[PDB]
């Protein structure tokens, strides 16, 4: 899996999300962040 | 020192004006475009940094300003108006320029002329490159286009600095032709002469662009630019590089993978090199449209909405109006100019001196058959007696070069 | 003749060393999927847009029957809906007609209006209105 | 790779020039028109 | 020159250039504005100058009543050219880059 | 490397040649506003 | 409030504005450029495709559209003019 892990200023991670649970989770590893303002997004196919 | 030349006759001449405002709508795809359904590929241009995130962003980024250069061009206005049923405009006749209710098309008479005049020509969808639909539809091209003829032909130029005004349309470019420098008095003695030779003009553009003569010169440079481009990207993956062959799929049934290091990053080095010329000659020919795109989005601002005093920005000659209309990758403007006819050759004179007293012209220009004086409008030639109303009265008579004597008709006591 | 080419100089078109009968060869991978998604701090349920693939392909094109689960909820179902740019799912089609925010294509936009979904519909063109004239 | 980089930047750059280079002209041409001055044009120094 | 460097000359040469700014002088002094809208219209100049002031807001009188002053004042400004192009700081900066 | 030597000349090239683009259709611009007419925008032509 | 500024006299300026409109037309040949006088050097470039069949184009593509900007801003004319014999202009000498 291709993973995403943020780091507070601690290094302790709060939260993480997975970039395979559905395609949403696709657009966030595909931009590299998680507050994007609203729009279009357009994702690499990765399905095998 | 005193000849002048003033117009006696008068023409109305439409013309045409072509301006590219979209391009074509393109899109290529990171890993489909250098090698697809490789898995063992990817893993090999995954070490090349970020490449296609910048490319196909920077490409991704073109489609954002194609979309806005169409909106900040054609829907300049927030309300769909629509044309009157009754088509009573004073003697014109504007059939050849409005939708045709009858088909099932919003394209006008004379866009279908045109979106046959000039072609597009696809079928290559499987290795990477796809072609992405326009935001607005052709359909809803027209559809802009209806409404902007039925504001500016009705409710004058109002519609533009606002809420719609009724207005006839011979009320309308009766006093636009005060714009120009001649009063309004041309127009209500010459409405029968202008409809007539402005239908004709309407007549004359309809036959040249049905005809076999290619006025639509530079909506094909265009099309064939992000034609060629296209063309140049899909010949150049049947070149090897170098490489022993130019498929992947014959060198992966080849070289083992420690021998195919060298051999299949040199063809991903190679096909990289192709790739990023493409994006960068489409980010100059995207800038290049988007500065006409913004001309293109001036003159809907300033030669449609409104009357221009610039010369020679809306077509050839004075402006009066211009009929924006629907085209396959641009806009057509139709420049309706004033253009001045046959002249006579006329003697002039600066001033007139009186009882010493110099009388200057307040509005015109001040000609003579010859023997006797008269005053008229600078840009068309309506002879009037000079009288202290159409002059005013400053300075001596000694202090301006070119004066002559002359008599002045006092009305108000008769 | 053994194989065809193209403009592309790409095998399309083979014939079979057997039967001898003519047949195509093209692959569809429309690797291209887009989403349509508000704010990502406002709402997670979301729709997808596939470019050009007619939604009746999609569990043959990518094999999805062996894929995960997850990957066959959006694959088919009720909230299918056809535009001319491909077709749409995730969506509840409505028949209004409004100013749209979101740009998709051909002309069929998105938005975050109510029980709460997004919805898509062509974009209205603005306000129709005529003027009084005689 | 590297020299590559900065190809990619420097072309970006000097076409993102162009981009603020027409409108910082085409600001300057309302610079002058539109506070110098009052302008005639339609729907050049805003709506109306 | 060496290594493949071709320049092809310019499409209008510089001594035809210099014409259409001759034609375009001879344009602009003797008919203003109508030459460049339709048929030329022959104009004298001091007339011309007149239509111009009333462009800008100027009335029709303040160019006959001073034009003997405009006649001196407005060569001066040519005879100025020569001055602030002769001098070793030019001014065809842009030109020159 | 001569390639890209020569490749950069032409991305040089065709970047100088848009901005040569926007100079000439300020100057034919003017051509038709500041010479074959008479304009009322101000601060265009020259400086009054 | 109740002031306001009126000028009793004027004067005439002339300033020079400077806009380039073309520059030197360029053309590079690949078959002699890159590989010198050299035959089995032109080989390897035939070998990458078409570059220097799209970079020709490129060059000329632009000395084809400079070629237009001098059009573009000198021949807005139809006719050609000349100075009458007289030179009256009303005391403008136009002679420089
Ligand atoms: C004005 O016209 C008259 C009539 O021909 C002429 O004699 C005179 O010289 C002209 N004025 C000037 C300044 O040349
Ligand atoms: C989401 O973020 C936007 C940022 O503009 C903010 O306006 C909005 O209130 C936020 N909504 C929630 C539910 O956090
Ligand atoms: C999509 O599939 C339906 C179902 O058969 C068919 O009627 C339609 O023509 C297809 N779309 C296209 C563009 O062929
Ligand atoms: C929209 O209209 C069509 C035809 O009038 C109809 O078949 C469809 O059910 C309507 N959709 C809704 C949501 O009512
Ligand atoms: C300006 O100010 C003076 C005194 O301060 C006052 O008399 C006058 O009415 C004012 N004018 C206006 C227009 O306010």
Same mark, same amino acid.
């Given at each position: 899996?291709?993973?995403?892990?943020?780091?507070? /200023?601690?290094?302790?991670?709060?939260?993480?999300?997975?970039?395979?649970?559905?395609?949403?989770? /696709?657009?966030?590893?595909?931009?590299?962040?998680?507050?994007? /303002?609203?729009?279009?997004?357009?994702?690499?196919?990765?399905?095998? | 020192?005193?000849?002048?030349?003033?117009?006696?006759?008068?023409?109305?001449?439409?013309?045409?004006?072509?301006?590219?405002?979209?391009?074509?709508?393109?899109?290529?795809?990171?890993?489909?475009?250098?090698?697809?359904?490789?898995?063992?590929?990817?893993?090999?241009?995954?070490?090349?940094?970020?490449?296609?995130?910048?490319?196909?962003?920077?490409?991704?980024?073109?489609?954002?300003?194609?979309?806005?250069?169409?909106?900040?061009?054609?829907?300049?206005?927030?309300?769909?108006?629509?044309?009157?049923?009754?088509?009573?405009?004073?003697?014109?006749?504007?059939?050849?320029?409005?939708?045709?209710?009858?088909?099932?098309?919003?394209?006008?008479?004379?866009?279908?002329?045109?979106?046959?005049?000039?072609?597009?020509?696809?079928?290559?969808?499987?290795?990477?490159?796809?072609?992405?639909?326009?935001?607005?539809?052709?359909?809803?091209?027209?559809?802009?286009?209806?409404?902007?003829?039925?504001?500016?032909?009705?409710?004058?130029?109002?519609?533009?600095?606002?809420?719609?005004?009724?207005?006839?349309?011979?009320?309308?470019?009766?006093?636009?032709?005060?714009?120009?420098?001649?009063?309004?008095?041309?127009?209500?003695?010459?409405?029968?002469?202008?409809?007539?030779?402005?239908?004709?003009?309407?007549?004359?553009?309809?036959?040249?662009?049905?005809?076999?003569?290619?006025?639509?010169?530079?909506?094909?440079?265009?099309?064939?630019?992000?034609?060629?481009?296209?063309?140049?990207?899909?010949?150049?993956?049947?070149?090897?590089?170098?490489?022993?062959?130019?498929?992947?799929?014959?060198?992966?049934?080849?070289?083992?993978?420690?021998?195919?290091?060298?051999?299949?990053?040199?063809?991903?080095?190679?096909?990289?090199?192709?790739?990023?010329?493409?994006?960068?000659?489409?980010?100059?020919?995207?800038?290049?449209?988007?500065?006409?795109?913004?001309?293109?989005?001036?003159?809907?601002?300033?030669?449609?909405?409104?009357?221009?005093?610039?010369?020679?920005?809306?077509?050839?000659?004075?402006?009066?109006?211009?009929?924006?209309?629907?085209?396959?990758?641009?806009?057509?403007?139709?420049?309706?100019?004033?253009?001045?006819?046959?002249?006579?050759?006329?003697?002039?004179?600066?001033?007139?001196?009186?009882?010493?007293?110099?009388?200057?012209?307040?509005?015109?220009?001040?000609?003579?058959?010859?023997?006797?004086?008269?005053?008229?409008?600078?840009?068309?030639?309506?002879?009037?007696?000079?009288?202290?109303?159409?002059?005013?009265?400053?300075?001596?008579?000694?202090?301006?070069?070119?004066?002559?004597?002359?008599?002045?008709?006092?009305?108000?006591?008769? | 003749?053994?194989?065809?080419?193209?403009?592309?100089?790409?095998?399309?078109?083979?014939?079979?060393?057997?039967?001898?009968?003519?047949?195509?060869?093209?692959?569809?991978?429309?690797?291209?999927?887009?989403?349509?998604?508000?704010?990502?701090?406002?709402?997670?349920?979301?729709?997808?847009?596939?470019?050009?693939? &007619?939604?009746?392909?999609?569990?043959?094109?990518?094999?999805?029957?062996?894929?995960?689960?997850?990957?066959?909820?959006?694959?088919?179902?009720?909230?299918?809906?056809?535009?001319?740019?491909?077709?749409?799912?995730?969506?509840?089609?409505?028949? &209004?007609?409004?100013?749209?925010?979101?740009?998709?294509?051909?002309?069929?936009?998105?938005?975050?209006?109510?029980?709460?979904?997004?919805?898509?519909?062509?974009?209205?063109?603005?306000?129709? &209105?005529?003027?009084?004239?005689?």
């Amino acid at each position: 899996r291709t993973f995403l892990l943020k780091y507070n /200023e601690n290094g302790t991670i709060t939260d993480a999300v997975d970039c395979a649970l559905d395609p949403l989770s /696709e657009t966030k590893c595909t931009l590299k962040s998680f507050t994007v /303002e609203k729009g279009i997004y357009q994702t690499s196919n990765f399905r095998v | 020192n005193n000849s002048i030349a003033i117009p006696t006759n008068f023409t109305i001449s439409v013309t045409t004006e072509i301006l590219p405002v979209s391009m074509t709508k393109t899109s290529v795809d990171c890993t489909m475009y250098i090698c697809g359904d490789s898995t063992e590929c990817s893993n090999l241009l995954l070490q090349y940094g970020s490449f296609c995130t910048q490319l196909n962003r920077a490409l991704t980024g073109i489609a954002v300003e194609q979309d806005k250069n169409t909106q900040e061009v054609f829907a300049q206005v927030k309300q769909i108006y629509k044309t009157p049923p009754i088509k009573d405009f004073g003697g014109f006749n504007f059939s050849q320029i409005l939708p045709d209710p009858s088909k099932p098309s919003k394209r006008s008479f004379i866009e279908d002329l045109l979106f046959n005049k000039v072609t597009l020509a696809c079928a290559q969808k499987f290795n990477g490159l796809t072609v992405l639909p326009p935001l607005l539809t052709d359909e809803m091209i027209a559809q802009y286009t209806s409404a902007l003829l039925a504001g500016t032909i009705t409710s004058g130029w109002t519609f533009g600095a606002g809420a719609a005004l009724q207005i006839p349309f011979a009320m309308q470019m009766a006093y636009r032709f005060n714009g120009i420098g001649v009063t309004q008095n041309v127009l209500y003695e010459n409405q029968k002469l202008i409809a007539n030779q402005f239908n004709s003009a309407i007549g004359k553009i309809q036959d040249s662009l049905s005809s076999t003569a290619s006025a639509l010169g530079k909506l094909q440079d265009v099309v064939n630019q992000n034609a060629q481009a296209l063309n140049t990207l899909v010949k150049q993956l049947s070149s090897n590089f170098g490489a022993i062959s130019s498929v992947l799929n014959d060198i992966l049934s080849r070289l083992d993978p420690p021998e195919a290091e060298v051999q299949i990053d040199r063809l991903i080095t190679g096909r990289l090199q192709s790739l990023q010329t493409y994006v960068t000659q489409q980010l100059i020919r995207a800038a290049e449209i988007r500065a006409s795109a913004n001309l293109a989005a001036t003159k809907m601002s300033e030669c449609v909405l409104g009357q221009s005093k610039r010369v020679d920005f809306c077509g050839k000659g004075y402006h009066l109006m211009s009929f924006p209309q629907s085209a396959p990758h641009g806009v057509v403007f139709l420049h309706v100019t004033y253009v001045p006819a046959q002249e006579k050759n006329f003697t002039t004179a600066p001033a007139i001196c009186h009882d010493g007293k110099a009388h200057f012209p307040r509005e015109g220009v001040f000609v003579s058959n010859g023997t006797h004086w008269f005053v008229t409008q600078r840009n068309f030639y309506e002879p009037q007696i000079i009288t202290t109303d159409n002059t005013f009265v400053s300075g001596n008579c000694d202090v301006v070069i070119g004066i002559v004597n002359n008599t002045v008709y006092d009305p108000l006591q008769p | 003749q053994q194989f065809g080419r193209d403009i592309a100089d790409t095998t399309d078109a083979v014939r079979d060393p057997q039967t001898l009968e003519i047949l195509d060869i093209t692959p569809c991978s429309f690797g291209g999927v887009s989403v349509i998604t508000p704010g990502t701090n406002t709402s997670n349920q979301v729709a997808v847009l596939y470019q050009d693939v &007619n939604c009746t392909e999609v569990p043959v094109a990518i094999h999805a029957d062996q894929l995960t689960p997850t990957w066959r909820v959006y694959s088919t179902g009720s909230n299918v809906f056809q535009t001319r740019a491909g077709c749409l799912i995730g969506a509840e089609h409505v028949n &209004n007609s409004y100013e749209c925010d979101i740009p998709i294509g051909a002309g069929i936009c998105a938005s975050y209006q109510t029980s709460q979904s997004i919805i898509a519909y062509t974009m209205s063109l603005g306000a129709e &209105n005529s003027v009084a004239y005689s």
